[PDB]
Structure formats: C-alpha cells, structure tokens
Structure 1
Amino acid sequence: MKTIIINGVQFNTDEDTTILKFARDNNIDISALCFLNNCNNDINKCEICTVEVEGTGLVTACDTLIEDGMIINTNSDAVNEKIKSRISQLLDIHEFKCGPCNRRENCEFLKLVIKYKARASKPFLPKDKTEYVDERSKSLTVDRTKCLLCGRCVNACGKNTETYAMKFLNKNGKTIIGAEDEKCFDDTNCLLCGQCIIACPVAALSEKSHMDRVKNALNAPEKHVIVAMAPSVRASIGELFNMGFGVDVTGKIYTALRQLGFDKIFDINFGADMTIMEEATELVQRIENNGPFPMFTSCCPGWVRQAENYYPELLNNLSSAKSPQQIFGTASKTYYPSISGLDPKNVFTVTVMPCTSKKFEADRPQMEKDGLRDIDAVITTRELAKMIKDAKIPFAKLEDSEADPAMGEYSGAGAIFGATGGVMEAALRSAKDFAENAELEDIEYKQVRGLNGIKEAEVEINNNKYNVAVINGASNLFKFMKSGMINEKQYHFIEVMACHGGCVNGGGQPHVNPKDLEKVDIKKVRASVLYNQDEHLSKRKSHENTALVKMYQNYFGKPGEGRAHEILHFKYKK
C-alpha cells in the first residue's frame, strides 16, 4: 500500500487519486476554486488548493497525485499565506458588494474570504460598470466585475456541450470570458443551456431576468396572470429552503404561487401531456408510410439551437409539436379565454423553468398569434425562489394545495419529462396505444431511463420492430452523429436533451457547491421525485388526463389535424 501522513495524521491507501480528492473523502478539507468537472484552469491556475509536501515544497493539490512517502501540509503558514495572497489578489479585480448580489446566500468566494480572512489592497470600485456588463442575450448575462477568471464556465461548456461557445478572449490586453468574437451569445453557436452559470462560483454569470415582467404584470389592473411550473421545479426548489435533496414540494409551490398574487395556478405538465398528444400522433403518421425518419424531439430549445447551428438538415425531421411551454402558452391565449370570460390580450402567461434557454424560446419572433405571445415571461427555479423569499413566504411550513384543474392536471407520462428518457417513455406509452388502438397494460420503458450518455431500445408496435435512441446531453449528440452511430440502423424516434441528466440538471436550477455535490448524485435524486410521482399516479398516460380530453374534444378537435395542426405546431426553416 501507499502511506501518507497529512498533517501528522496517519493514512494508508490503495487509491491513486489527487491530494485534494483523497482529502475530500477523508474529512480533512483543503480549499479549492478553479477545480471542477475533473479539471482545473490549466492556463494560470488559481492555487487555492496549495499544500506543501516536504522535499518538493508548495504544489497544487487538485492535480498533484499522492505518493507513498508523502508528508503534506495544509494549515501550515507558507501554504496559508500563498493562498490568502491569491484570494486578496482576486478581490483587487472583484466588486465586493454582497447583498444586493444574487449569490450572497450561497456564494463560495465570500466563503473563501471569511475563512482565510482576506482583504483586497485597493477594493475595486469601477465608477462605470458598462464595459464589464453584457445583457444583450435573451438567456445569459455577464457581469465581469464579479469574474474570477477561474475557467470553470469554459471547461463546463466544453465537457457538457463540446461547442466551446464560452471562450477565453483577449480584449485589448486583458483576458475576459465571453462568446465568439465577444458577440452576444444568441448570435453564436451557443445553445443558451446555462451550464456555464451552473459551474460559476460567483455572480459573474446569471440568467437574463424576467422578474420585472412578472412584477409589472402582477401590479397591472387588467392583467390576469397565469403561472405554470415545469416538471423539474417541484423536485428541486426545496434545496434553496434548506429542506434537502430529492424532496417533493409540488403542493407547497402551488400555495406559494397563490400567496404571490397569481390569478391561476396551472402546470407545464399539462402542456407535457399536450405535446405527447401531438407528437405521438405524428410518430404514428410517420410510421404510416416510410417516415421521414428519424423523428427527433423538439422540446429542448438547447437542442433546437444545436440543430440549427450544427445540423440544419435535421430541422425537417424534428417534431412539429411545440414544446410543453409553448404549446401550453398557445392554449392559454385561446382555450383558457374561451372557458374563462376573458379577452386574450389581458391574459399574461408566466412559466417557471429549470432552464435559461426557455427564455430565448418564449421570445422567438414567430412564437405568437396575432400580437399575442404564447409565453410572456419565463422565470428560472432560482428566480421563483428569490421572489418567494422577498415576499417572506414561509415555504418549508406551507400547507399543500392543489393546482387549478383546467390546465393544471397531469398524468404520470407528463410527470417524468424532467428526466433523461422521460419524453421518450411518455411518447411510447401513447404511441403504442394509438397505433394498435388498444389500452396497453405494460408501460414501463426502464431501458431508456438513467444516466448513460447514449441509450437505445427496440420497441414492438403492431408486431413490427422500431428503434429508438435517447441522447443525454449535447456532447453526446455530437458523439452520436460524428461516430456514425446514427447509421448503424434506421432510427424511428430520437429524444435529445441538451443538459446531462435532463432538465433536472438544467442551467436555471439551484446551485449545489462541490462539498455537497461530492456526496449527492443530483441528477438521480432530483429525477427520483418525478419517477415516484408517475408510479403513484392513477393516470400514467397523456391521453388519459381528464382536463386535457375536455380541452381537445371541446376546442381543438383531434390531435395532429385541423385546428390542432394550425396553432399547436411550429416548424424551423432556419
């Protein structure tokens, strides 16, 4: 075995990890900053993980591997001053205004300021922040007075998407981060997925706020404000109210939304059953006569932008059904005004999403019908948590309430949408029933579920064999295509999500912090809430939702045709 004494404490091990990863497992904490996603900043490291090992001296723990004769120093003095110096040097390029900062109660730099008791030199107060700020994007915002240049957003974008859309740039003499040619992210190959925000330790990267759109709508006398939350929100916002991980808070969120002043409390899972209603019918129509194959999902805006910027020839193969957000939005300006006494231009639709790319989607020019936007505002999970906290709603102690039924009811098929393989499984439950005109008992497609990057399965429909694939994350779509895996058989239906794990690990989700992220498999525990909802729901197929059936029979007619085909669809030409 190898045998090391870190700070005079005895440890023998048959593990060949780094000093930082051995220490993380063994309670002895070493501080770190640029290390994340099994990588550090290769080009000018932050050196917060400095330790000293006798004989050699000061090394960076996040990438120095343990040796059998080591004696390592953490608390030390020469180590401790090398690190505190580094933090103070970052405060020289940091605007230290915690509160009103959106990262105040979970920062991880404020935490390294009070632990090492570091102070700037000259505190950094730019009189004009314009040059540092970029807010041209519909999904992402940058404030470089908070940027530590730790390279975490660049490495996270490369691992998670492989687009390398978040780059290190040379502006004048300085190094900044941003998009291709310091352009607005929307005008580049960027997917607006937000994984760079999730990797950022500070408030340098944030979602484009839609807080004032919601605010103004709630104070506006004539506006009827509709709110509907995504599948993933109920499996994750309780993390921000110190309730833990994998806690189902569906009922608390409906109550909280009533206390914020919303007029109707609906849900995007109703919209998810609507999308399956259209898309599963479209899949049956593509199986009747030979395609076009493959039909791809078109509900993830990060993926839609990936197939626009990188695979434009696939745009025709995408499902014409609108994403749950946008299909719900079209119906909230048409169906809901006809069952309530309202004029559609006084309805304002707000969604709560685990995603920043949803903001871009809602704001797309043609995502409207004669002046009325499908969706008027999209706030992330972190933004809903902010506005609950501002109102002082005692979230953890709220009584559970139910959604308003007409557009808030949902089946278990819609419920699993927030996990990778969720849309695939939900579409197959309805597509197999529609094509064979039966009510099938077996509905679990466990083989398309889970955290494997590329999952496939063979499905039998009408005693014929069909192949389906599930692409977990945008880096895996590039691997699927470039590998020629797409060509090893004829695929009939392919689900694609841009974020790894699915929407439960989207770019608008609660931050976690690495010394917690080490302990919890966050993609699995957030997803388990949703799968448990499906398993305990009596309706587990989209077409069985009672409020959905009332809407289609009384207002849209049959799926995939006539009126349903008119307004609940969107095709991308460009």
Structure 2
Amino acid sequence: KTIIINGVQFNTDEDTTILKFARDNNIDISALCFLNNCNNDINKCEICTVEVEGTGLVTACDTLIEDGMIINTNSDAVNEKIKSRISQLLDIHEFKCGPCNRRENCEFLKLVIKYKARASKPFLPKDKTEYVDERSKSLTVDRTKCLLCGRCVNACGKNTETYAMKFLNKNGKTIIGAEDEKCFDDTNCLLCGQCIIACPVAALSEKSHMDRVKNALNAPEKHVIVAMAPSVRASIGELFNMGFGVDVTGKIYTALRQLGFDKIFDINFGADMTIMEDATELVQRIENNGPFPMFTSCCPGWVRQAENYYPELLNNLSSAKSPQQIFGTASKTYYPSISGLDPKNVFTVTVMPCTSKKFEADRPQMEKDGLRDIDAVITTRELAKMIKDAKIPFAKLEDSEADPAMGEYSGAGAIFGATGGVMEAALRSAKDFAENAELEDIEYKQVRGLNGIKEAEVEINNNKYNVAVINGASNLFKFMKSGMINEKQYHFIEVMACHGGCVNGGGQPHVNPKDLEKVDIKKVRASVLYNQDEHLSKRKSHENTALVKMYQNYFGKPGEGRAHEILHFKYKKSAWSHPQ
C-alpha cells in the first residue's frame, strides 16, 4: 500500500499504527498516554493528533495505516489541537517544577516546553492534603500532578494482572487509586511499583525513607551501615547522564562514603547467605524426596501475591530470609560480634531497585530483641537524589571498595538482580552440596532471558529434577491458572514480581518511551551483573570467604540450629475463620 506523510511517499506492507510507522521512519509525532503498546481508551490524550486527508484529526497511536492515506503531522491546526490538550492538562496540574521529584526527567514538562502551552487558569490548590495519599509503606500518590493518562492502570494490568490500580469515582471526580480508595497495602496490590515506572509525571512515587536516613546519619551515637542491591550498580548511572549498562559499583561505594555512611557493605553478601540457606534446604528436600515444590521467598512482591491469591502455597516458600532481611538480621547480631558496636546503635540502610522492599523491611516481625533487621530502605532514585543534593560529582568519582566483612560477594550473588539469577546461583550451590563436589560447569543459560516462563530439567546426584523461573507476576498468574504447575512435578521454582527481575524494579530510574524503544533496559541492566559474575574468581555463594568465616565462627551449620533460628522467616496462611 501507499502512504503519504508530510509530503513523503512510502510504499509498505506493514500493518501497524501511524505513530509506529512514523517513528520507524524518523517522523516526529508526540505521544503521552500511549505506553506498553496501549493508550487510554476511555479519555485519549490526543497529543498524538495528526491530520488524515478525508478523515480529519485522528490519534496516530491507535490508528492503523492503510492504502491511500495522506497524513500531515505538523500543520497549524494539528499543533493547535495538541497545544490545546496540553493546556487543558495544565489546567488540572500544579505546575511547580522547582521542588518536584521529576524535575529533571518529566515527559509532561517536555511536552509543555515543546508546544509552549500554558494553563487557561493556573491550578493552585492551597490544601494539598486531600490530593495526597501517604498511607502506604511503599507507594505515594500526589493527584495535583496526575494527568489521568491511565498508564499506571495499564501497566499494573499488564505487569501483574491484579488491576490493583484502578480508575475511581471520588465525589463525582475521576481519580486513580486502589480498590475503594483504600491504602494500597490493604488491598491485593503487590507494591511492585510498576505503576510508578509507567507514570510520566510525579503523580506516583515511592514512600520516602530519606528523612530516616538523614536523621540516622546525623545522630551522633548511630552507626549507619549501608548496603546496595545487585541491580543498583547497573542502573544508577542512568540518572547521572552516563548512559545505559554502565557498571558504577566503585563510584557508588565512594559516593556512599562521601555521604557519611559509617560502613559500606553489600546486599550481594546477603544474596550469598540466602543461597547458602536455600541450597541447604533444597538438598535436604532432595535427599528426603520432599516436600516439593520449593518456592523462592526473596521477592516481597511475589510474597504478597502468594499471600493475597495463593495462601495454599505459603508453606512451600523457602523459610530463608531475603538477601535484604537476612543481611539486616546478621547486621544486628554478627556484625556487633565482630566490631564491638552496641547492637541497638546499629542502623542498617539498604539501597533497592524496589518499592516492595520498603514494605518487607517494616513487617512487624522482621526484628529481634527489639532491633529491626532493616531500619530504612531507599530506592535507586532516592540515592540519586541524595547524591545530587550533596553535590557529589558522581560521574567523576574514583572507585573505592566495600568493607569486606559483609561486603564480599560471589558472582552467584552478583546475578541475583536478573530473572533466573537466583535459580542459577541456587543450582550452582546445590549441585556441589548434594554431590559433595566442586563442579566446574556452573552456567545455566537455560533459565536466563526475558521469557515469561522458563522451565528446565537438571541432573543432581544423578536424579532428574524440574525447575521453573517465573518472570513477572502476570506470568505467575498464567503459570498457576493454566494448570502448568500440574503438568509435571516441579521441585524448585523461582518467582519475580517484576518482568526481567529486580533490574526492572519499581524503584529504578525512569526511562522515557523513546529510549525504551531504542534500548532493551532489562537486558542491558542484567548485562552488568552477568559480566560481574563472568569476571569474578568466586562464582559460588559457598565460596565467599567472608561468608564462610561468618558461618564458621558465628552462625554454624546453615539451615539448622542458630542459623535456622535467626536467619529464617516462615510465612503461614491465616487460620480458618468465619466470617471474613
């Protein structure tokens, strides 16, 4: 068929939208509510407006190309309409970018500047309390910034299929929010933060723990430990104009030291701990030929999904604490034992790519003798904001190392941040354990990648076992509802709530749709972790020298005794009750 766009003739066979065809051919068309191959069907934003001869103004984002179409994307009428839409949005938008947390990477401000739009009447509510919801331990809503674009709703539907984010009718006005406008924590919401990642403005954000960290740092008697998740070192550079896929581990260590933290550890050490415990548990279930299957329990989003939809599986989840919580528990017990610090004066902070980790850290029972395992969790974005507010020249910093007592990590722990990393590491350790060997073939590429559901057969002690990696909460729903769990006997199943793994976490740096279309952020971010694992000498969790010392001199045998007593956390279904 033949297409004419801005006077240029194309002869094509594709069956696609005007927007996608124009972007494939370097023709600029604006867009806002279109994301994840979906737009806001009920109140289209119409910023992708184009003129089609014989039809009039159409939305390029959901209008398929067809033979004989003559399109104009830059006429005075088209730009007039788009600017009118942006002005109408500003009419409901508190346009005060100074203190806004999306000041530096906001799609809406970009469009406003592009079209020189201005509100017909400035939106200036002087009682913001009715527009804000800070009840959640993980999420926060600021509806003075909400464009009602629907990208959060669509993203929740696609990534989790829970539809916990919904359009609501509050006092005859349309808002976005949780079921019955409740606190997200009190619903089936997973707190995964994918809605945040899909928001083009500062309407949805993470629950800030920055004041916690500041107060702890400024308290004279507090010894503030900091430890970052695997994915942080593969991601934060994006917010300092360093590009995608840049390993900035040493820069992060140096920046953390410059921010005043008293000890620089690493959550990958806790990942090696979790692998110790989980591989021991798996080898035991194997030698006992049950119980099966065993689910990972390190992803709090998947933990909430199980609690809210599949309580019958809670008993099959590993009792090992997640890397964050296991690290914190050890930080309040073993670390004082090798340092002399009063355990009550230790304040443990984690840097996570995740908003659900905030909920996990504040679980009432995630403490001991009155000491929280983890006292504060800040997202990648939060750490970036802290670094910039301190005017630390991150991109120019020299590399430093972490304190090794709880900062060393193997490649097994290094790849935790990618989908299938936990399973690969656990297999690396479990095969050696069960066969009492030091096997050299350790790479399990079969469980890697962005496939939603990845199954594999593995040979351990010359018996065959079936493992599955569930990559995304929606894929968990598909795996369960489909009956796939019953096609064969599964023995060890990894589950991540965020497709691609923690590298695509809800607390990660925002990426504009164009950059997303030109870069596979999931793959490029996981590339850093897999390279680290490639170039590490210790690639099995149980080879971590610092962790081996910790277990030999303090915790003892993993999976039992003091180790099980302190480093484990068993989820349990709620007892039968009536009514509900």
SS across alignment from 1:105: coil
Q: For residues 38 and 172 of structure 2, what CA distance do their matches in structure 1 show?
A: 26
Q: How big is the shift at 1:33?
A: 0.6
Q: Deviation per CA, 1:381-426, whole angstroms, max 9, x where unpaired?
A: 0000000001111111111111000000000000000000000000
CA offset at residue 268 of structure 1?
Answer: 0.1
CA distance in 1, matches of 2:129, 2:464: 58
Structure 1 residue 11: Cα displacement = 2.2
TM-score of the two chains, using structure 2 as the length reference: 0.98
Q: Which moved more, 1:397-406 or 1:10-19?
A: 10-19
Rounded Cα–Cα distance in structure 1 between residues aligned with 2:121 and 2:513 = 30
Instruction: Give the whole-Å Cα distance in 2 for the aligned partners of 1:145 and 1:12.
Output: 46
- Bigger shift: residues 68-77 or 154-163: 68-77
Indicate the SS of the match to 1:124: coil
Alpha-carbon deviations, 1:510-543, whole Å to 9, x = none?
Answer: 0010111110000000000000000100100000
Mean Cα deviation higher: 303-312 or 25-34: 25-34
Give the Å deviation of 1:39: 0.6
Give the C-alpha shift of residue 247 in structure 1: 0.6
- Taking the aligned partners of 1:10 and 1:231, their CA distance within structure 2 comes to 49
| Count of matched residue pairs | 573
Q: CA deviation at 1:15?
A: 1.5
> Shift of residue 439 of structure 1?
0.8
**What displacement does 1:80 show?**
1.1
Deviation, structure 1 residue 99: 1.4
The yes-or-no answer on 1:58 pairing with 2:41 is no
CA distance in 2, matches of 1:32, 1:292: 51
For residues 191 and 317 of structure 1, the distance between their equivalents in structure 2, rounded to whole angstroms, comes to 19
Separation of aligned partners in 2, 1:5 and 1:357: 48
Query: TM-score under structure 1 normalisation?
Result: 0.99
Query: What secondary structure does 2:417 align onto?
Result: coil
CA distance in 2, matches of 1:15, 1:246: 32
* Alpha-carbon distance in 1 for matches of 2:478, 2:177: 25
Q: CA deviation at 1:273?
A: 0.1
Distance 2:72 2:173 in 1: 34
Q: Which residue of 1 aligns with 2:562?
A: 563
Q: How far is 1:290 from its partner?
A: 2.9
Q: For residues 239-282 of structure 1, what are the alpha-carbon distances to aligned partners after superposition, in whole Å with 9 as ceiling and x for unaligned?
A: 11111011100111000000000000000000000000000000
**In structure 2, what is the Cα distance between the partners aligned to 1:153 and 1:303?**
19
CA distance in 2 between counterparts of 1:408 and 1:289 reads 34
Q: What SS does the aligned partner of 2:195 have?
A: helix
Distance 2:401 2:10 in 1: 54
Displacement of 1:10 in angstroms is 2.6
1:84-130 C-alpha deviation (Å, 9 max, x unpaired) = 11111111110001010000000001011111011101111001011
Mapped partners of 1:27, 1:510: distance in 2: 26
What is the SS of the residue equivalent to 1:565? helix
The Cα shift of 1:14 comes to 2.2
- Write out per-residue CA displacement over residues 125-181 of structure 1, whole angstroms, 9 at most, x where no aligned residue: 001011110000000000000000000000000000000000111111011000000
How far 1:341 moved relative to its partner?
1.4
Provide the C-alpha distance between the structure 2 equivalents of 1:535 and 1:33, rounded to a whole number of angstroms.
40
How big is the shift at 1:12? 2.1
What are structure 2's unaligned runs of at least 5 residues?
574-580
Deviation at 1:339, TM superposition (A): 0.7
- What is the rounded CA distance, in whole Å, between the counterparts of 1:391 and 1:209 in structure 2? 17
The Cα of 1:298 is off from its aligned counterpart by 0.1
Instruction: Give the distance between the partners of 1:337 and 1:93, measured in 2 at CA.
Output: 53
Alpha-carbon separation, structure 2, partners of 1:225 and 1:25: 50
Q: Name the structure 2 match of 1:17.
A: 16
Aligned equivalent of 2:271: 272
Matches of residues 343-362 of structure 1 in structure 2 within 5 Å?
343-362=342-361
Q: Distance in 2 between matches of 1:311 and 1:237?
A: 34
Note the alpha carbon deviations across 1:212-247, whole angstroms, 9 max, x for none: 000000100000000000000000100111110111
Measured in 1, the distance between the counterparts of 2:478 and 2:40 equals 25
Post-superposition Cα deviations, 1:347-393, rounded to whole Å, max 9, x if no partner, equal 00000000000000000000000110000000000000000001111
With 5-14 and 306-315 compared, the bigger mean Cα shift is at: 5-14
Aligned residue for 2:168, secondary structure, equals: strand
What's the offset of the Cα at 1:483? 0.5
C-alpha distance in 1 between matches for 2:429 and 2:514: 42
Gap regions ≥5 residues in structure 1: none
The alpha-carbon deviation at position 288 of structure 1 amounts to 2.1
Matched with 2:478 is 479
Structure 2: distance between partners of 1:193 and 1:224: 30
Q: Which moved more, 1:205-214 or 1:287-296?
A: 287-296
**Secondary structure in 2 matching 1:27:** coil
State how far apart, in whole Å, the 2-side matches of 1:12 and 1:516 are. Answer: 27
**CA shift at 1:23, angstroms?**
1.1
Deviation, 1:289, is 1.9
* CA offset digits 1:266-325 (Å, max 9, x no partner): 000000000000000000111122322110000000000000000000000000000000
RMSD in angstroms over aligned alpha carbons? 0.6
Q: Offset of 1:449 from its aligned partner?
A: 0.3
**Aligned partners of 2:285 and 2:177: how far apart in 1?**
42
Q: For residues 256 and 391 of structure 2, what CA distance do their matches in structure 1 show? A: 12
Distance in 2, matches of 1:412 and 1:382, equals 25
Choose 15-24 or 102-111, whichever is displaced more.
15-24
- C-alpha distance in structure 1 between counterparts of 2:418 and 2:441, whole Å: 20
* Partner of residue 387, structure 1: 386
Does residue 71 in structure 1 map to residue 76 in structure 2?
A: no
User: What CA distance in whole angstroms lies between the structure 1 residues aligned with 2:70 and 2:336?
Assistant: 72
Q: Distance in 1 between matches of 2:175 and 2:218?
A: 39
* Alignment partners' CA distance in 1, 2:240 and 2:25: 28
Measured in 2, the distance between the counterparts of 1:207 and 1:13 equals: 44
Distance 1:398 1:14 in 2: 51
Give 3-state SS (helix, strand or coil) of 1:273's partner. helix
User: Could you say what secondary structure the match of 1:189 adopts?
Assistant: coil
Q: 1:528-573, CA deviations, whole angstroms, 9 ceiling, x for partnerless residues?
A: 0000000100100000001000100000001001000101000112
DSSP-derived class of the 1:82 partner: helix
Say which SS state the counterpart of residue 212 (structure 2) adopts: helix
Matched residues in 2 for 1:66 and 1:249: separation? 44
Q: Secondary structure at the match of 1:191?
A: coil
Q: What is the Cα deviation at residue 44 of structure 1?
A: 1.2
Deviation at 1:74, TM superposition (A): 1.1
CA distance in 2, matches of 1:160, 1:31: 25
Identity across the alignment (%)? 100
Once residues 314 and 165 of structure 2 are traced to their aligned partners in structure 1, the CA distance between those partners, rounded to angstroms, is 24
Partner SS state of residue 378, structure 1: strand
Q: Residue by residue, what CA displacement relative to the aligned partner does 1:408-448 show, whole Å, maximum 9, x if unpaired?
A: 00000000000000000000000001111111111010000
Aligned-partner Cα distance in 2 for 1:23–1:501: 28
Distance in 2 between residues matched to 1:217 and 1:39, nearest whole Å: 43
2:161 maps to what in 1?
A: 162
